[model samples]
Target: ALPDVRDGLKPVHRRVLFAMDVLGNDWNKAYKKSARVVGDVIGKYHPHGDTAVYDTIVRMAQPFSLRYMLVDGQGNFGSVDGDSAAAMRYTEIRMSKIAHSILADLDKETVDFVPNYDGTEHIPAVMPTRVPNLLVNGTATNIPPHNLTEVINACLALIDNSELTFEEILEHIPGPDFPTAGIISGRAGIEEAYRTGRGKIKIRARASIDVHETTGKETIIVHELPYQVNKARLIEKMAELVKDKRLEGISALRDESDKDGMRMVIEIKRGEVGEVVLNNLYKLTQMQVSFGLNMVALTNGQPKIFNIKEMLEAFVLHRREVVTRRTIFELRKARDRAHILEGLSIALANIDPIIEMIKNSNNRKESEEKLISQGWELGDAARPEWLEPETAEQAKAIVDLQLYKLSGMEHDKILSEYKALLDLIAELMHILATPARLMEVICEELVAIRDEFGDERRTEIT
Candidate 1:
């Protein structure tokens, strides 16, 4: 059995990456039907359906699904028109450079591999990324194209400074980067959501409708939106209101989105204020949007709904756990290697006699016998001379020396370093062992870390 290493990506991610890889990383090549990709994924990597696999792939590529896309698409890969692609056969696809890079070393022993649904030994349970991917390329619905360089710089600054708390990090990087060219209002809730890992964002349409007098006739010209509120639906809803006499005094309705930022004009016979029209539209159409603040996600093998603070805290806890596991694994390997090296060093100390014995002996057993008979003494050649003991008295005096010498450190130095590492490991393990406790500890640690390392970055929540 292997040590449990937890990260929350599910089989969908694995299947998608594998299927994309087999599709030759070419958009044209990948167009060979959704069924093909789904078959490959299920038969070789994933044990899911063609529909589910295709849906997952489409979602991953969609700008609204992830901040950074891992898939490239051709043809009508769905649209704001609210149309889905005409099955996998009609669509062409490829892996994005980021996707290819991320999955490049999957065949390596960096992560654990597992049998696929078909018991095929070709799938990886998870990828061991050296970088903090959650922060670098955040996962969110309606996420925008975030500046990766900015995010990375901010993360590095925190790492170097150590005083930056989780709140500080959120302050440095604020809200989901939306691809749809729209403004987001009420960021406080967004900040709260990111910090706690759950919160609602209230988005309102930009003040787009401007009233103008044309021959004493009032016209309301609309411009801009609050993100992905469907334009056609907005128009249809407004038209329905007008038809039902819910909205009155409108002369005509026209869509002028092609000109700039999706404009819609509602002409009135006369004497209508822009605010009145806006209020009516808001009441009837997509002028105001409220996203529910349910930050539900998979964490440590369980699905959880989080608040803003809880989300950030969860990320921090996961990162710390990874670091702790890596540190322990590194130390264990080093210690094991040191032991083997010590044995080699002992054999080398008496080379002259060993050579003579080897030459005189007729066989392997004889050589071993001759060496033992000579009371062959190999000193602490692997270790330093200062660590060697000559008597039982000397041995007691340096009883703790074995650990220290093997690690090439003094007793106190080793003890202190070990204690520090141990404390960090325990702290990290505690969070992982009881994932439920992550939110509280994350809040506490973030505050402490920020107080120790935070710098000036404007944050509304902070």
Candidate 2:
């Protein structure tokens, strides 16, 4: 399955999110058993095996696998050492907070919804993401993830000026910030990838050579490895090389990693140099790795490779559409509410006669008719905006009204509410009408998300 260029999520990822959303499995809520979510996914949307659904959830939950994890897994998902996760029944999960932004305004009809597999329920066509998810999380390709802060800043800069060049964007987002913090060898590959959407980057393990104070013997201490490099397997591979005597470094290999951080200690013999052994390890093992960045994703159902600017532009375009749609939805809702409020206001002003008519009627339906039949005075309550055939809706609202709302204070509250709704209507209309205002909304939202979720870059680009 291909990932959408806007959200950077494949079908499984989107379905998992939608299922969790329907279940009210939010970040603040208690975690649900992974099996429950997996079952929902397989049964409702994806007609696949349980493992496939669960594997998607597992990968999304793993920090090393994703730049921003969509699922906040409570139990053992997996580890960097290449260990398998526990069964779905054992793990618990909820939508991560950042994921909420990806699904933001989903209920506002921002994106289309289609029927599920059996035509039972509807699911969103695509998530109306507030966060620029594609650039933040990247795809399954070796097109590595980036720092949220840097991405957001780049987005903001682009929003301010659409004419911003690729070099300008590079200033904001220097390079990929892999979750597995390491050192990138150079910028040539990164620049090529950002420009052409494909390039090869060499990432080296964060290592240092140290000499013992008294013994004067050297040790190569690897602080971090290339992204996705299996620690256990790398250690095993080194051992194999040392055993065969193909890689010469009179030394001992040990994993001194702990809760604090990783420290892969390779003890060197007194006669041998540490740098030589480290170089051999790099060449033979996964100490350093080549990541081929292929930024291929589905744009409007068509697969296309995208350079950095193209991806950013796509995300901005998506946000523009989403924000415009959301404004329309909210405007319609506000206008409808204002209409109802106007109806109620008319009834409140004509409270005495309306109450009398209601009491005189034989039945509820007849009373509703009587209330609608009479031509009520406008008074100060009703506005000129009530141009439609308003009597029926007003009559129904009156009938449904409780005794408490007839109080003077309640009427005042209704008038104030109507005034606020009018102001909101105008504001929403302004946003929909002006592209600049809409862009401002997008920029503001991006800055907020950046402030909340952004962090220091992990992988160092040299």
Candidate 3:
């Protein structure tokens, strides 16, 4: 019932991302109609109502909704003011660049796949995410999002020194960075959560007090709100509080938020202390809120809450496994191609004899059998390291060869391709042989991602 700790995605969210990936909706491509995306997901993967699938997609595209937005929507998706997205008919969607990274190497057998509702389609059971998405967009187990740069730095730190202590890891990662740029008041809760896996932290809207030179009037300018607190609803709540006299600052309240940014202007009357009134507003309104951290996630198909170190550890383990599987898959493919090329090179070396055998045979099948029975020289001066079996595969390949390929130039070209493949096989085998190289690959990936999509932290922790 918990999200896979490796990717930190619940089943529904996982399905939505996987479904969009299958629809040819990618970062570089043109955006597809949202309704079309919804229809595909519903019919093939999710099998839910249109409304549920649409909501999942909207959240995927919402920057405020996911720490790293998986979907890049091209039209009115929604706003911080609680506006609903334009109808699926009007909007279009595509995967973001970061999302592409998440789904990278998916076709290479990096993770398992299960059949969709009707057993007609297969969807990924988990994502091979580079960043710690669970911490990027926290969960009800309650970990909130963090700065992408911070998370990457933390990951890099672990790769460099796997023996990092929790406090040492904190050097790279400080605390949760909300999408809504608010001010986190303290680190006490954050420390506790990182140390033990659960705690509560307080966040306050970025507000300022200004005094008018002419009238000595005071005003509070709210530049941001606590994460996920609706602006319209907060204003309504403040207005209601002012009417009830629960908030006793003589002032006029109005939302001056425009295209520039969020600005809630609360004008205080003369002789009223702005700081006192602002504190009262914070106490009475949604301008300040508490976030309870519960880092619960599924590890090995079981739900488990994780501390900061454990979370990073989970992600690193996942990366190691995914990269290993990918390399092995690649190695097998490279070797198979090399096997055929090795046979072709042998055939090229004995072109005259191979042709005579073909001519002497009664038919194609007999030619194949005779070729298979003849064992070629194991190696030559240029390819002393090359080893191949005396098998029917080479004979079958010889029978399929055309006269065009028997040209003198094709002989050298084939040798060149074989040499290149041998080098590739060596490199791929070395990756699996050395643990450090595997980690280096992971580090390189993280560095590329950080440089590409990572940006300044939106939330400020005081």
Candidate 4:
């Protein structure tokens, strides 16, 4: 039930995304059937029934559900009309383009992992997402999803300079952008939410009056609805009001919505004011809705309320650790490979003698021990000044070497690779030694995501 503040993912949603990743589901890859994904999630990570997993997947793929969809689903993923999705076997899914940014560089060990429910597999403790998904997807506390560009810019500003003002952040991220496009009526509440992470947002559906020049008959056209309000049910409520004689102006109702977008026509009684009736619709029906902004999420394994500034700080903090750890992992892998090359280079230096020594040995273990006992010169392809290449690693590398190393070109190639590794080890050391260098890499990753998926704000404040 708790959402991680850093990435804005709940236990089930996080597990579903992680499971999709485990199944090799990527943005560019073919979509796997939803039944297969749901089965994997409930069996391994979530430990829940198939219904819960499938429902979570459906919401993640709905365009009208989240501001930025995390899942790219095919074949009947439900609709804004309140229609239910087809069975799990009828749908297919894969990670969306932006979803890739959340799980970016996971293979490099960017975040921590723990054993899955049955202990047969492992899953990430928290996603190393570039953007603040909590704010992007919103929270159960009625905190709303935000514009991608605005949230990203505010974060970039913080990374550029942590000492940021509430007013300054408002310049980038002004207010919530509900996936349902509607006109927000005020900024006082938006300010309160951004500054203190607590406020009640007031939004009204966008309706316009079409005055017929000939008939002078006024018709109110409803273009949008409040966030999360069921469209089909709203129409039913209006019809009920008409039957009850509460709404006097509407003579008839017609649903004219096509690919052009939402259009609910309310024909006004002749000589009656259409604007006045429209205001009544807002007051009586589900046309206007209020959302209380209470930003509660898990921070460092503990739930905490967070302001916009605090949320950005948490994400940057997460990315800072991810980049450093990934760098360390890469550095260690490169160093291990270089150590093997170091031993191989040594064996190539005395190729003929080493071959004769192996030939004279009584058995495999005897040959391996002799190789371990021998000490070789550290030439230009020297042991890294920082690392003491372990003896076992060098001996193992030597024993694994083949007859091809006797070739003159092959020996030269080994030395070339060792030199490159020496240069890389120094760079890795610089990254660890300097904090600014690590921050730059973090910014690079975030910026790449912004360029790929950032878009215009869908909700606007008056």
Candidate 5:
């Protein structure tokens, strides 16, 4: 399945998220049973049953699986050693806070909606994600994880000026930061990949040689493995290599990994150099691996390769459109409320006359009709500058007004609220009128997300 370049999600993945959103499984809320989410996912959107949906949910929660997990799952979601997750019944989950950013502005009509498989319900075609998730998470095919801070800064750079050189963007994001912390040796590979959209980069496990204080015997300790390299399998491969005489200078092999961290001890033979032994293990085992960056993803429903700039460009463009749409939606809503408030204020000011009119009218329908048909003075105290009701909905709003609103204090309250709304309406209109102001909103939001979630780069470039 191909991931959309905008949100970096396959159809199933998007459906899983949309299902979670529909269930109100928010970031801060209580975790619903994993089975519940899956049931809804299959019943409503994806139309895939337990096994497939459960697996996708599990992967989304697994720390080693996604760079930044979309789902915050609790229970056995498996390990780096390729252990399988518990059944959906055993686990519980909600959206991660970062995942919330991915679905941000969704309700504001930011993205398009398409009917699901059964055409009973509609789902967002692509998430109006604030986080540059495609770059931050990358594709599971070969693209590696990047530090959120670096990626956001890179986005901010591109947003300010699209004409900036690739090297300038590179300055913001040096290289990929794998979830499994390791050392990426060489910049040429990263540069080539970021420039050309395809290249091979070398990743090595973070290891150190420890020499015994008394005996001078050295041991190679591996602290981290290459991204996606199975630790158990790596150890087994090393043992097999030693048995086959392909890997030498190791007298003992032991795993001391625990809750603290990974510590794979490869005891070098007394006569052998620890560095030489470690180098041999790198050559013969999974201690060192190559990540071939393909960077292929669905751009507008078609598979396309994107370099660093192109990827950032796609994300920026998407955010711009979403923000614009959301602003328009908000502006319209504010204006609608303002209109209703105008009608309410007018009715409140002429309370005696309106109440007499209402008393004389036949029912709700007649009162609303009379309210729309009658001409009234705009109150000098409350809403002198306000316009009269322009639509039947405004009269309907006045008819729906509560009896308590006729009180003197409530009238003051309505006036104050109306003034605040007017200010908000002005602000929303200003944001829409100024394109740079809209971009500023996008940039500000990006910076806020960056500050909230950005972490230090785990993978070092040398």
Candidate 6:
């Protein structure tokens, strides 16, 4: 039986992972259909429907939807031909390399496993990912596999180098790389995303048609596509046009796949013009397309859509929180340890007599009793050796625990400190947790930080 543990995954994520795992990372397995997978998920782990579960699994496996997919699927899961995958039973399935990696630590108790829909254990609440998979791989339409690789590399570099500034870290990476082969207008939106953890990117296809000299034939060639267009669909639609004889004089249609990548070529007869035909194809099919810029992400625990400014704001806030928490935790550890050190130092000052007293004591209870009877003279005598009188006084003066003990004040002071720290951390996390909010916060802070730091410089006359 699987070990009992607790996880925090949403129903959808849990079910999808479990289904993939049960499917055994196989490329040839054909045991169940999408409906069955969905049914098993809802009955065993998830509370959602067969359609939603199956749909989510299918989308997760689609290369078009993700830069790197987690699910390993087989048998025409779906196609860019604008057709959905056949029912689950008709297709085989398994996990991809990336998916397998994401779930690698499951057996090691890296995450908690919880009961499924039937009250039998079958799912993990969340996977323990040492790396930030969401940001690296991403769920945005504009991001592609190559771009994810670059982002992951940049993030790793920043983590490994202690002195890398945020800007420096961002320098190695620019923007989302889409497999659909579109060009991002610029780096503005990308920067925002990195800074805030979310941002919208403006993208468009690269179009170019050239003329050949041998017979003065003008050939129409589409070199690039929008991030969302379906390449397979574009090819299929063009083939259909040729078969219907709507436009004649086309010599050949070929998909030239080589080291340079996918190049769809439309060859025509000598002295023939194919501009109108190309334009018509673009108008009717996936040759030309536009993708809405929805850069959404799971920030804080909720999904948020972000624009350029909002994303940067979120990142700043998140970093600030990390810094603040580290600082506060360090301070607490130092203060507490210092207090204990001071006590030890004081006890040591009495030297031989205090040691003798401690040795002669029957037990901790008797030692305290004897010490109290002596008016705790050992503490006073030992103080000089353990600490300098001035240093001890300074330490005591700043120590919150000592201050609280000595003044016999209300607990509000300690509570206030704790509350303030918590609030700051919360603010930082809030920005990190939501994409839309992240954008808003980033925009607000950018203006604020710039205004706060911007200088009206004196110009020198040349």
Candidate 2: global Cα-lDDT? Answer: 0.86
Off by more than 4 A, model 6: 1-10, 22-36, 47-49, 140-146, 161-166, 196-202, 206-213, 231-294, 303-462
What are the lDDT scores of the predictions, listed in order?
Answer: 0.54, 0.86, 0.83, 0.84, 0.85, 0.51
Segments of candidate 5 deviating more than 4 angstroms: 380-390
| Model 4 clashing residue pairs (backbone) | 8-134
lDDT of 2 by residue, 68-171 (tens): 89999888887888889999889999999999999999989899899898899888878898777777877736567899998889889988888999999999
Name the top lDDT candidate: 2
TM-score of each: 0.59, 0.95, 0.90, 0.92, 0.95, 0.51
Candidate 2 vs 3: which has more lDDT: 2
lDDT of 1 by residue, 52-107 (tens): 77887787677544545667766656655456867777776677655654454454
Q: Write the per-residue lDDT of candidate 3 for residues 1-462, one digit (tens) a residue.
A: 578888878888878788788888888999999999888878888776758788888988887677778899989988889999999999989988888888899989999998888998898899988777888777647778888888889988888888899888777887888878888877888889898988898899998988888987888999988889989999899989888988887578888887568889998977878999988887887888988888888888777878898888888899999999999888777776777788898778767766787788788888888866766764422222344521566567768988899888887887798888888888987899999899989999999988997888777877
Q: Write candidate 5's Cα lDDT for 1-462 as tens digits.
A: 888889988888888999999889998899999989989988888775557788889888877777789999889888888889888889999999999899988899999999988778999999999888877887735677788999999899888788979899889999999888899986798999999898888899999988899999998889988889999998899889989988888899999986568889899888898888877877877899898998988887687878989989998999889999998888777777776787788878878877776788888888777866777797722222344623477778877888888888999988888888888877887898998999999999999999999988888888
Cα lDDT for residue 195, candidate 1: 56
What residue pairs clash in candidate 5, if any at all?
none
Candidate 2 — which residues are off by over 4 angstroms? Answer: 380-390
What total of clashing residue pairs does each candidate reach? 28, 0, 1, 1, 0, 24
Displacement of the residue 179 alpha carbon in candidate 6, Å:
2.9
Q: For residue 123, what is the lDDT in candidate 6? A: 71
lDDT of 5: 0.85
**In angstroms, how far off is 202's CA in candidate 5?**
0.9
Give residue 48's error in model 3 in angstroms.
2.5
Q: Ranking by lDDT, best first?
A: 2, 5, 4, 3, 1, 6
Over all chains combined, what TM-score does candidate 1 have?
Answer: 0.59
